[PDB]
Structure 1
């Protein structure tokens, strides 16, 4: 669910003697469990816990274990402002070109905006982890590229229609696209939320 994922950091300390010799009994708090440091941090801690349990031993019987768990999350303001806000403006440029009644200039603006989308992918290349599987952020960028590339295909069809002599048909396509295009993005976002977040 990158970048909206929450992880757990577990620090386990195990005794190396059987539980009939030494056993963990009490937990003392001689200092703050999570210290405070100046400045901001990449991972922020929301809660923590400490517990004592028993685990099987290689000798036999059991031994004691002391566990400290920290619940962490990322910095959401970083990804929203740096990635999602610029992405929205690039996408909205391809939506607004359908108001033009000429297609020799709509086609060249649509083709030019596809290059800006690809170039924008280089800046945020560092912010995209190089794992072997798709994440939530990776899926959204693939859908956006396909919709931007389809706009170029529709523009070519409209120009051919106008040159032949049928312009009313081309004008009706503009009305349908201006309505359907914002609808597909809204529907896809809801689908992503249902699949990965609300079970």
Structure 2
């Protein structure tokens, strides 16, 4: 989606004809497969697809090279946690007929569950307990007043 930022872009060739290409990239990718129904307990796939722009009878992806760790480590925490990954070569139909090669990398990801649990669910549980416990009272005016106050507290926490 839109333009791609590239760094260190180079092609180099030897007298045999052995050639190679390198690029460091930053890119934004469309992903309508996303599905957030189960939020925050949802799980998603981040897939990156590279297609050859030429017919399969001219060029075809044939081997995968692991020149680094596929997903690299970084200091500190991340919002999205990679549980597993994979990399694969396939072939797909091409304009003006025939077929082209495709290389896919896919990351399986989940959220930090402790964040949501501790931040939302425990205070909610305490608020619910507050409205539950007041039914032991036998002075119904106090119970009414505390219920009314607890409802406002609930709304305040919700908008917080």
TM class by smaller structure: 0.7 to 0.9
How many residues get paired?
123
2:87 is the counterpart of 1:32: no
Structure 1 residue 122: deviation in Å? Answer: 1.5
Match of 1:62 among 96, 99, 113: 99
- 1:114 aligns to what? 151
Q: Which is helix-richer, 1 or 2?
A: 1
2-structure distance, mates of 1:103, 1:119: 24
SS in 2 for 1:54: strand
2-structure distance, mates of 1:80, 1:59: 53
1-structure distance, mates of 2:64, 2:96: 26
2-structure distance, mates of 1:23, 1:91: 61
- 1:96 aligns to what? 133
Give TM-score, length-normalised by structure 1. 0.61
- 4+ long deviations beyond 4 Å: none
Structure 1 residue 59: deviation in Å? Answer: 1.4
1-structure distance, mates of 2:73, 2:141: 60
- 2:59 aligns to what? 22
1:67-109 per-position Cα deviation (integer Å, ceiling 9, x unaligned): 0000000000000000000000000000000000111111000
- 1:10 aligns to what? 47
2-structure distance, mates of 1:39, 1:105: 49
Q: Which is strand-richer, 1 or 2?
A: 2
Gaps of 5+ in 1: 124-199
Instruction: Give the CA RMSD over aligned residues.
Output: 0.4
2-structure distance, mates of 1:74, 1:56: 35
Structure with higher RCO (Cα < 8 A, 6+ apart): 1
Give TM-score, length-normalised by structure 2. 0.76
1-structure distance, mates of 2:46, 2:115: 22
SS in 1 for 2:83: strand
